[PDB]
């Protein structure tokens, strides 16, 4: 009978092992034990992204944002979901928001957020070129 924290730690190990559906299931078990912890949802969202399930990832990002409206990772992963779902304007807004929140919170993710922003803007532009 593991604790919520033990379940999160197991999920994290499975994630390192690139066992994403297994990791996601572990985070689900953690959520069962304590559904008020934003990180369980953002971790699972990342798993769903790796599993090419942006719809499921998006719902987890929404759950995380309800718990912590300032979550950098929830905004970032939400943007990634929207990008995959070809909602480019929303994606860019969320990645920009992630960038702004990371700055406000004095968090350092190197060039990860700007790089994702560039990818999103490039994808947006390319979608326009694909239509003319």
């Amino acid at each position: 009978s593991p604790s919520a924290q033990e379940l999160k730690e197991q999920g994290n190990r499975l994630f390192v092992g690139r066992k994403y559906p297994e990791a996601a299931a572990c985070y689900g078990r953690a959520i069962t034990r304590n559904p008020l912890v934003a990180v369980y949802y953002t971790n699972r969202a990342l798993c769903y992204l790796k599993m090419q399930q942006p719809e499921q990832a998006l719902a987890d990002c929404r759950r995380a944002l309800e718990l912590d409206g300032q979550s950098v990772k929830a905004h970032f992963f939400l943007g990634q979901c929207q990008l995959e779902m070809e909602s480019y304007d929303e994606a860019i807004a969320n990645l920009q928001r992630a960038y702004s929140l990371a700055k406000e919170q004095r968090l350092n993710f190197g060039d990860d957020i700007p790089s994702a922003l560039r990818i999103a803007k490039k994808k947006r532009w390319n979608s326009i070129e694909e239509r003319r």
């Binding site: 994290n12 990791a23 190197g110």
Partner: peptide, 6 residues
């Protein structure tokens, strides 16, 4: 990175 679990 940012794409990492916590």
């Amino acid at each position: 990175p940012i794409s990492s679990v916590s």
